[PDB]
Every structure is written in C-alpha cells, then in structure tokens.
Design a protein around this ligand. Sequence first.
Ligand SMILES: COc1nc2c(Nc3ccccc3C(C)(C)C)c(C(=O)O)cnc2cc1-c1c(C)noc1C
Length: 127
Amino acid sequence: SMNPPPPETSNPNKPKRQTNQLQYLLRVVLKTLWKHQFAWPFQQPVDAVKLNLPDYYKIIKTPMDMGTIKKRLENNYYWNAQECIQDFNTMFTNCYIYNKPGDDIVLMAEALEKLFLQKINELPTEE
Ligand SMILES: COc1nc2c(Nc3ccccc3C(C)(C)C)c(C(=O)O)cnc2cc1-c1c(C)noc1C
C-alpha cells in the first residue's frame, strides 16, 4: 500500500477551540473554495496509486488537502486561525513544488489561492 495514512483530522489529546476567526474560516473561506469549479482535485488527499504518481509521496512529505482542512474545522481540531491558514498554504505549496509552472493544476491552485488570500485579507478580529 503506497499511499501514506492521511493527515489526522481529530486527536483526543490536542486541545480544541472555537473562535469567531475559525468559524469564519469554515463558513466563508472553506465554503467559498470548496464549491469553486477548480476545487475538486484539492477536496481529498492525493491518491498517488489511482492517479499513477509513484513519486508523489517521495517528493511531498507534508501532504495537505481541503478535505482534511474541512474535517479539521468541523472537528474543532485547530486551536487558532493560523494553524488552519498554514494548512491551506501547505496545500498550495505542495502543488507548486510537485507540478511544473503553467500546468493546469497549478493555474487551478493559483485561482483558488487568489480567492483564499482575498478572504484572509478580510479576516475578522477576535471577539
Ligand atoms: C495533477 O494534479 C492532480 N490531479 C488530480 C486529479 N486529476 C489529474 C490527474 C493527472 C493529471 C491531471 C489531472 C487534473 C486534475 C488536472 C485533471 C484527480 C482526479 O482525476 O480525480 C484527483 N486529484 C488530483 C490531485 C492533483 C494534485 C494536486 C491538487 N496537487 O498535486 C497534484 C499532483
């Protein structure tokens, strides 16, 4: 089995918290990206077996995807907004590292990232 286990989406020992910033990240940021027409390749972990990408998990050692992020938010896995923002950045970065500049998947990622940055620019203050 050449896929690694997916990133954890819950952990009984990791402290849980709900902030208005994390609620914004689920209700506005994640929702906006999730339903976007280019979202689908990013909605679940990269299945390197089914996609026939043997070298993927030899190159990408910190995988991340929006399915994982969605579940983390729904499970109150994050303590703060920065943890979640970091996961989005990891997802985009992995795509830019593994794929060639100008590839369709890169253009899809760039479009989602632009939308992401717009919404993060409008992050609300802590209540
Ligand atoms: C190439 O990047 C991906 N492609 C798919 C994918 N389809 C696919 C397969 C080969 C070539 C091109 C594609 C397109 C997405 C451009 C159509 C599928 C699928 O067909 O179900 C699923 N997950 C992916 C993740 C990725 C992906 C992401 C996201 N980041 O790196 C990779 C690699």
